Design a protein around this motif. Structure first.
Motif, PDB file in Angstrom:
ATOM      1  N   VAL A 146      49.557  47.671  42.502  1.00 50.22           N
ATOM      2  CA  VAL A 146      48.557  47.006  43.326  1.00 50.22           C
ATOM      3  C   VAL A 146      47.185  47.254  42.721  1.00 50.22           C
ATOM      4  O   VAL A 146      46.933  48.313  42.136  1.00 50.22           O
ATOM      5  CB  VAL A 146      48.613  47.502  44.789  1.00 50.22           C
ATOM      6  CG1 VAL A 146      48.200  48.967  44.877  1.00 50.22           C
ATOM      7  CG2 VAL A 146      47.746  46.634  45.693  1.00 50.22           C
ATOM      8  N   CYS A 147      46.299  46.270  42.855  1.00 47.81           N
ATOM      9  CA  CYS A 147      44.938  46.415  42.364  1.00 47.81           C
ATOM     10  C   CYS A 147      44.158  47.396  43.231  1.00 47.81           C
ATOM     11  O   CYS A 147      44.377  47.504  44.440  1.00 47.81           O
ATOM     12  CB  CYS A 147      44.229  45.058  42.347  1.00 47.81           C
ATOM     13  SG  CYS A 147      42.524  45.117  41.751  1.00 47.81           S
ATOM     14  N   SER A 148      43.238  48.119  42.595  1.00 45.18           N
ATOM     15  CA  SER A 148      42.434  49.121  43.281  1.00 45.18           C
ATOM     16  C   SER A 148      41.130  48.567  43.839  1.00 45.18           C
ATOM     17  O   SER A 148      40.424  49.289  44.549  1.00 45.18           O
ATOM     18  CB  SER A 148      42.121  50.283  42.329  1.00 45.18           C
ATOM     19  OG  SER A 148      41.341  51.274  42.975  1.00 45.18           O
ATOM     20  N   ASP A 149      40.795  47.311  43.539  1.00 47.20           N
ATOM     21  CA  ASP A 149      39.552  46.714  44.018  1.00 47.20           C
ATOM     22  C   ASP A 149      39.764  45.958  45.329  1.00 47.20           C
ATOM     23  O   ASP A 149      39.121  46.261  46.339  1.00 47.20           O
ATOM     24  CB  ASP A 149      38.975  45.780  42.949  1.00 47.20           C
ATOM     25  CG  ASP A 149      38.635  46.508  41.662  1.00 47.20           C
ATOM     26  OD1 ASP A 149      38.861  47.734  41.595  1.00 47.20           O
ATOM     27  OD2 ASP A 149      38.145  45.854  40.719  1.00 47.20           O
ATOM     28  N   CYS A 150      40.665  44.975  45.323  1.00 43.90           N
ATOM     29  CA  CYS A 150      40.936  44.162  46.501  1.00 43.90           C
ATOM     30  C   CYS A 150      42.271  44.474  47.159  1.00 43.90           C
ATOM     31  O   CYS A 150      42.559  43.918  48.225  1.00 43.90           O
ATOM     32  CB  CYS A 150      40.900  42.669  46.132  1.00 43.90           C
ATOM     33  SG  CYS A 150      42.109  42.184  44.879  1.00 43.90           S
ATOM     34  N   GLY A 151      43.089  45.341  46.564  1.00 45.62           N
ATOM     35  CA  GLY A 151      44.372  45.679  47.146  1.00 45.62           C
ATOM     36  C   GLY A 151      45.435  44.615  47.010  1.00 45.62           C
ATOM     37  O   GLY A 151      46.469  44.706  47.678  1.00 45.62           O
ATOM     38  N   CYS A 152      45.218  43.607  46.169  1.00 51.29           N
ATOM     39  CA  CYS A 152      46.204  42.550  45.995  1.00 51.29           C
ATOM     40  C   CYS A 152      47.465  43.105  45.349  1.00 51.29           C
ATOM     41  O   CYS A 152      47.402  43.786  44.321  1.00 51.29           O
ATOM     42  CB  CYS A 152      45.624  41.421  45.146  1.00 51.29           C
ATOM     43  SG  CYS A 152      46.804  40.108  44.754  1.00 51.29           S
ATOM     44  N   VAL A 153      48.612  42.811  45.955  1.00 48.86           N
ATOM     45  CA  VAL A 153      49.897  43.293  45.454  1.00 48.86           C
ATOM     46  C   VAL A 153      50.316  42.402  44.290  1.00 48.86           C
ATOM     47  O   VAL A 153      50.647  41.229  44.481  1.00 48.86           O
ATOM     48  CB  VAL A 153      50.962  43.301  46.558  1.00 48.86           C
ATOM     49  CG1 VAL A 153      52.304  43.761  45.994  1.00 48.86           C
ATOM     50  CG2 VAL A 153      50.516  44.184  47.720  1.00 48.86           C
ATOM     51  N   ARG A 213      45.711  41.721  34.663  1.00 49.28           N
ATOM     52  CA  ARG A 213      44.551  41.389  35.541  1.00 49.28           C
ATOM     53  C   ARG A 213      45.020  40.942  36.920  1.00 49.28           C
ATOM     54  O   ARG A 213      46.174  40.554  37.104  1.00 49.28           O
ATOM     55  CB  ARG A 213      43.694  40.295  34.901  1.00 49.28           C
ATOM     56  CG  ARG A 213      42.963  40.737  33.643  1.00 49.28           C
ATOM     57  CD  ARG A 213      42.137  39.603  33.057  1.00 49.28           C
ATOM     58  NE  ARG A 213      41.313  40.050  31.936  1.00 49.28           N
ATOM     59  CZ  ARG A 213      40.107  40.598  32.055  1.00 49.28           C
ATOM     60  NH1 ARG A 213      39.567  40.780  33.253  1.00 49.28           N
ATOM     61  NH2 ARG A 213      39.440  40.967  30.973  1.00 49.28           N
ATOM     62  N   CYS A 214      44.112  41.000  37.892  1.00 51.51           N
ATOM     63  CA  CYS A 214      44.442  40.585  39.249  1.00 51.51           C
ATOM     64  C   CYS A 214      44.448  39.060  39.347  1.00 51.51           C
ATOM     65  O   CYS A 214      43.539  38.404  38.830  1.00 51.51           O
ATOM     66  CB  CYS A 214      43.438  41.164  40.243  1.00 51.51           C
ATOM     67  SG  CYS A 214      43.711  40.659  41.957  1.00 51.51           S
ATOM     68  N   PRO A 215      45.452  38.466  40.000  1.00 49.56           N
ATOM     69  CA  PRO A 215      45.473  36.999  40.112  1.00 49.56           C
ATOM     70  C   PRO A 215      44.403  36.443  41.034  1.00 49.56           C
ATOM     71  O   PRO A 215      44.092  35.249  40.937  1.00 49.56           O
ATOM     72  CB  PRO A 215      46.881  36.710  40.653  1.00 49.56           C
ATOM     73  CG  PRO A 215      47.259  37.945  41.387  1.00 49.56           C
ATOM     74  CD  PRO A 215      46.632  39.083  40.633  1.00 49.56           C
ATOM     75  N   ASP A 216      43.834  37.260  41.922  1.00 50.68           N
ATOM     76  CA  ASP A 216      42.818  36.789  42.859  1.00 50.68           C
ATOM     77  C   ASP A 216      41.408  37.026  42.325  1.00 50.68           C
ATOM     78  O   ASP A 216      40.627  36.079  42.176  1.00 50.68           O
ATOM     79  CB  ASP A 216      43.001  37.480  44.216  1.00 50.68           C
ATOM     80  CG  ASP A 216      44.333  37.157  44.858  1.00 50.68           C
ATOM     81  OD1 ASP A 216      44.890  36.077  44.568  1.00 50.68           O
ATOM     82  OD2 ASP A 216      44.824  37.981  45.659  1.00 50.68           O
ATOM     83  N   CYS A 217      41.069  38.281  42.031  1.00 49.82           N
ATOM     84  CA  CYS A 217      39.729  38.641  41.584  1.00 49.82           C
ATOM     85  C   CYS A 217      39.617  38.791  40.075  1.00 49.82           C
ATOM     86  O   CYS A 217      38.498  38.885  39.561  1.00 49.82           O
ATOM     87  CB  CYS A 217      39.285  39.947  42.254  1.00 49.82           C
ATOM     88  SG  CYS A 217      40.322  41.374  41.863  1.00 49.82           S
ATOM     89  N   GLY A 218      40.735  38.816  39.352  1.00 48.74           N
ATOM     90  CA  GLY A 218      40.688  38.958  37.911  1.00 48.74           C
ATOM     91  C   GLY A 218      40.376  40.351  37.414  1.00 48.74           C
ATOM     92  O   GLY A 218      40.144  40.525  36.214  1.00 48.74           O
ATOM     93  N   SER A 219      40.363  41.348  38.295  1.00 43.47           N
ATOM     94  CA  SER A 219      40.069  42.713  37.886  1.00 43.47           C
ATOM     95  C   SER A 219      41.276  43.338  37.196  1.00 43.47           C
ATOM     96  O   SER A 219      42.426  42.948  37.428  1.00 43.47           O
ATOM     97  CB  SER A 219      39.664  43.559  39.092  1.00 43.47           C
ATOM     98  OG  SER A 219      39.377  44.891  38.706  1.00 43.47           O
ATOM     99  N   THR A 220      41.003  44.324  36.342  1.00 46.16           N
ATOM    100  CA  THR A 220      42.033  45.022  35.587  1.00 46.16           C
ATOM    101  C   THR A 220      42.330  46.409  36.154  1.00 46.16           C
ATOM    102  O   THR A 220      42.926  47.239  35.460  1.00 46.16           O
ATOM    103  CB  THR A 220      41.630  45.133  34.115  1.00 46.16           C
ATOM    104  OG1 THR A 220      42.677  45.772  33.372  1.00 46.16           O
ATOM    105  CG2 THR A 220      40.340  45.936  33.959  1.00 46.16           C
TER     106      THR A 220
HETATM  107 ZN   LIG Z   1      42.358  42.697  42.465  1.00 41.15          ZN
END
Ligand SMILES: [Zn+2]
Ligand SMILES: [Zn+2]
Ligand SMILES: [Zn+2]
Lengths: 122, 97, 76, 55, 50, 99, 49, 39, 98, 166, 86
Positions: D22-29, D1-8
């Motif tokens: 990298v996440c595809s929702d917020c781009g968090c590395v 999961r993403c550490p910022d938004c929690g998305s998978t």
């Molecule tokens: Zn994310």
């Protein structure tokens, strides 16, 4: 972060009260948001220490009165710790000097207690 | 890495190091050879001068004299190889001032 | 007072780099830049204006030290 | 999961020869950089089979 | 160089101090002469002298 | 190829590129041409300040696709990098804080 | 100067590549040398016993 | 030396690292000390 | 309530003092004892043996199997040494002339 | 309360240059020594004053201004015989839990010297009758980080009489 | 061939030979008693210099009561060089 001397010089409660009041007035005059948000323990400790020193009878003190009390006790050959405790407590009763104050044996004399009470009350 | 097909970067050879030294760009040489190449932070014990982990010295079983320090990963590998060869480099740290 | 009064290129470079880093780290400007988005350009402008608040501490080989201001030194 | 938004929605996308999950929702590395042996290391290492390494 | 297929390297500093030092000390306008004998190396070349 | 000569005296670095050269007399002696392909790859970390705030905002709004732009952003509070190719770049540009 | 204990370094100095394409892995020479040293120590102990 | 500095990853003493810089900050060396009343 | 401890200090190396370690210091520095001559286990997973060579308690070399001594990945693991005792002493080739 | 000589290397970021150096150093020292117990010194309250402040260096790394400042700070460290006045912030069977006024809940007076009617049955009973005084006896400090509190001290309550409150 | 060992040898391997018991006798007992008496009496001897305590907290009236008092031997300055006089 080493310390050079942990017992450089003892100070009474009036000095701490004045320092806390100066810090508090400077803070309320130059308050900052980010500096305060970074560390809030400073505000809490300062406020609580000031509240404790206000609860105690340390009020109504001045450096002139402190110097007069010190010069009056210098003639009683009393020790620094005893005079510091007396200045910090401001005892109004005799028992507080008779029993509470340490090193009573041979120091009370049953005649100097009246002078000590008069000097601490004046 | 070395090759282009392996996604490798350029090599700042000894001649490039000599040119940088002759120019005197100390900060440039540092940023090139330490910061942008093999930057890493290790923990060195100020008592025995050895290398610890996670702010802990297994030699002295203490963590009061352990402090972080910037050092190239190549230099750390060299120190480890020397310690394996029994040549123990004892690092005596001090304040930057 | 015994060293050369001229400011060397190494000192120039180090002062400019330090000032550019400080400016990139949100340091105050003392020249009222006019649309200069480059910290190095801002540092060069401050050097030309002689307003960089930095004092060079030249150390001699024996151990002594001497302070020299940017506005006190001579630039080329 | 993403550490910022929690998305998978974590996708592994190499950006100009740089492996990065990298996440595809917020781009968090999430993670970046991979350690792989080079030609020199591959040539210096010797091949040993399980028949000998396992025991 | 002679523009006959030579491959040259290009580096980008990652620090403001390093950038300033490279621009000042390693400046092309400041290194127009060699420290060997002071002769200028950055000057006219073929197709310009003629 | 040892640790002293192969890994300490001379070592490889990143943010570099090897390319062929060609003549161009229309540029100054102190200027050099860099191609767009290598420019989009070699990035420079600029700190957000009170001077180039609008420039950084415009570069972020442009994004990695257009040549003038950026590729990653590292916040001041958290060191978690953010890829501009994913997510709304306008929000990231509007939420650019100093540092 | 006379050694009685050998300092086996960490795994960071001895990189191992798991070659799944075959039934083997790529190991450095230090690992093989240490394995041979341990084997010789065991053989010496067996001969002493 | 320079080689050991480059190996350890610290600015070499030669070049720009021979001297040190100071900040021209508005300060007051040896500020007034608060007098001690009890001592 | 809370103890005062410095987080980070700008420590600068002054000088490197080279030296040697006795067997006791080597044992103290090492964490485990490597006695198994084999590398991997008999199971089809080919996992490294315990108290043997290539053990993960002396660091890590794979991106999937982290270190056992410190709960960190390979990029953050610094590695740990090990001590192997020899039945009979041997001359150190480096210090043989010494 | 006692002054303690300290020498600290304070690091001020560049964006604070607009502020006065002495004021910034004082604020940083206060934020760094606010509610923290220094080993073998005691609990520091705040900064008293700054004695010496030498030149300000700027390193080629972070770029901030590092200044070695010598200062004096007040700390709560009795002299093994000081008398204080606290309040009872609870009580336990093995001993009462007294705490100085909003200062620190670390005073644990052992109940092993009062007249022979001492006992606590968990009902917050202080002591059977025949602003609480405290007499410090000894100090003690301990560490916290020991893997990859610190001030309790001993209190004494002799037969002080206490004509005001039993 | 030598077999492989999974766990390391014991840190303290057992031995089938035990130490021979100590010699018994009034002589040995008296020597032990004398050595114990020497250990007990040599620490209080003036030659047994202790670490000088420092960093006194405060001065009190009971200082004269708790003041450690012990006679100090006078070295022979004729035989000892002059570099040892206080
Ligand atoms: Zn994310
Ligand atoms: Zn240690
Ligand atoms: Zn590890």
């Amino acid at each position: 972060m080493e310390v050079k001397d942990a017992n450089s010089a003892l100070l009474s409660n009036y000095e701490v009260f004045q320092l806390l009041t100066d810090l508090k007035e400077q803070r309320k005059e130059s308050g900052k948001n980010k500096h305060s948000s970074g560390q809030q323990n400073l505000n809490t400790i300062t406020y609580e220490t000031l509240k404790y020193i206000s609860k105690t009878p340390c009020r109504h003190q001045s450096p002139e009165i402190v110097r007069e009390f010190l010069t009056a006790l210098k003639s009683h050959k009393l020790t620094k710790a005893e005079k510091l405790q007396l200045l910090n407590h401001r005892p109004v009763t005799a028992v507080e000097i008779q029993l509470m104050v340490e090193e009573s044996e041979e120091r009370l004399t049953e005649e100097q207690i009246e002078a000590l009470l008069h000097t601490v009350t004046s | 890495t070395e090759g282009r097909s392996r996604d490798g970067g350029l090599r700042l050879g000894e001649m490039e190091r000599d040119c940088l030294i002759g120019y005197g760009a100390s900060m440039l040489l540092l940023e090139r050879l330490m910061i942008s190449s093999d930057a890493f932070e290790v923990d060195v014990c100020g008592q025995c001068g050895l290398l610890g982990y996670s702010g802990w010295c297994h030699y002295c079983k203490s963590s009061c004299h352990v402090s972080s320090l910037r050092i190239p990963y190549a230099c750390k590998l060299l120190f480890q190889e020397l310690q394996s060869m029994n040549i123990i480099p004892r690092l005596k740290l001090s304040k930057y001032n | 007072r015994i060293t050369t009064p001229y400011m060397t290129k190494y000192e120039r470079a180090r002062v400019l780099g330090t000032r550019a880093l400080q400016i990139a780290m949100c340091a105050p400007v003392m020249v009222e830049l006019e649309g200069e988005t480059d910290p190095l350009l801002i540092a060069m402008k401050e050097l030309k204006a002689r307003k960089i608040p930095i004092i060079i501490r030249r150390y001699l080989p024996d151990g002594s030290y001497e302070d020299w201001g940017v506005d006190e030194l001579i630039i080329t | 999961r993403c550490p910022d938004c929690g998305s998978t929605e974590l996708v592994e996308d190499s950006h100009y020869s740089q492996s990065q999950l990298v996440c595809s929702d917020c781009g968090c590395v999430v993670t970046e950089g991979v350690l792989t042996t080079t030609f020199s290391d591959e040539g210096n290492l010797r091949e040993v089979t399980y028949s000998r390494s396992t025991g | 160089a002679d523009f006959d297929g030579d491959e040259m390297n290009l580096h980008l500093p990652q620090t403001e101090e390093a950038k300033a030092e490279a621009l000042v000390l390693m400046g092309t306008k400041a290194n127009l002469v060699t420290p060997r004998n002071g002769e200028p190396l950055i000057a006219a070349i073929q197709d310009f002298l003629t | 190829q040892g640790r002293f000569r192969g890994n300490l005296s001379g070592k490889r670095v990143d943010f570099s590129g090897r390319t062929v050269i060609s003549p161009d007399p229309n540029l100054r002696i102190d200027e050099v041409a860099v191609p767009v392909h290598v420019a989009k790859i070699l990035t420079f970390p600029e700190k957000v300040n009170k001077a180039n705030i609008n420039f950084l905002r415009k570069l972020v709004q442009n994004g990695p696709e257009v040549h003038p732009g950026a590729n990653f952003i590292q916040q001041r509070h958290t060191q978690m990098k953010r890829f501009l190719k994913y997510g709304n770049r306008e929000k990231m540009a509007q939420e650019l804080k100093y540092g | 100067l006379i050694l009685t204990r050998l300092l086996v370094p960490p795994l960071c100095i001895r990189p191992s590549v798991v070659s799944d394409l075959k039934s083997g892995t790529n190991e450095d020479d230090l690992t093989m040398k240490l394995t041979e040293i341990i084997f010789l120590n065991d053989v010496i102990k067996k001969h002493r016993i | 030396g320079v080689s050991e500095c480059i190996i350890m990853g610290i600015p070499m003493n030669i070049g720009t690292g021979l001297f040190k810089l100071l900040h021209k900050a508005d300060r007051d060396p040896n500020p007034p000390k608060r007098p001690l009343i009890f001592d | 309530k809370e103890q005062f401890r410095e987080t980070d200090v700008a420590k600068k190396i002054s000088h490197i003092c080279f030296g040697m370690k006795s067997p006791e210091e080597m044992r103290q520095q090492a964490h485990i004892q490597v006695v198994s001559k084999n590398l991997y286990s008999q199971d089809n997973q080919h996992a490294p043996l315990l108290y043997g060579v290539l053990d993960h308690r002396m660091g890590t070399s794979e991106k999937d199997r982290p270190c056992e001594t410190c709960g960190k990945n390979l990029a953050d693991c610094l590695g740990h040494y090990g001590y192997i005792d020899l039945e009979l002493p041997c001359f150190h080739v480096g210090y043989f002339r010494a | 309360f006692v002054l303690v000589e300290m020498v600290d290397t304070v690091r001020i970021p560049p964006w604070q240059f607009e502020r006065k150096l002495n004021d910034s150093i004082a604020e940083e020292l206060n934020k760094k020594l606010a509610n923290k117990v220094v080993y073998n010194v005691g609990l520091c309250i705040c900064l008293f004053d700054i004695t010496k402040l030498e030149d300000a260096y700027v390193f080629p790394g972070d770029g901030a201004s590092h200044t070695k400042v010598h200062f004096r700070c007040v700390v709560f460290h009795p002299f093994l015989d000081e008398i204080l006045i606290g309040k009872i912030k609870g009580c336990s069977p093995e001993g009462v839990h007294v705490s100085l006024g909003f200062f620190d809940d670390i005073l644990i007076p052992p109940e092993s010297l009062q007249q022979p009617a001492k006992f606590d049955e968990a009902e917050q009973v202080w002591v059977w009758e025949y602003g609480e005084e405290i007499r410090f006896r000894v100090v003690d400090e301990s560490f916290v980080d020991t893997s990859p509190y610190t001030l309790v001290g001993s209190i004494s309550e002799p037969g002080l009489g206490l004509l005001s409150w039993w | 061939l030598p077999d492989v060992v999974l766990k390391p040898p014991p840190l303290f391997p057992d031995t089938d030979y035990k130490p021979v018991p100590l010699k018994t006798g009034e002589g040995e007992e008296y020597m032990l008693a004398l050595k114990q008496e020497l250990r007990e009496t040599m620490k209080r001897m003036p030659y047994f210099i202790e670490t000088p305590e420092e960093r006194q907290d405060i001065e009190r009236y009971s200082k004269r009561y708790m003041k450690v008092y012990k006679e100090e031997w006078i070295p022979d300055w004729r035989r000892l060089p002059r570099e040892m006089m206080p």
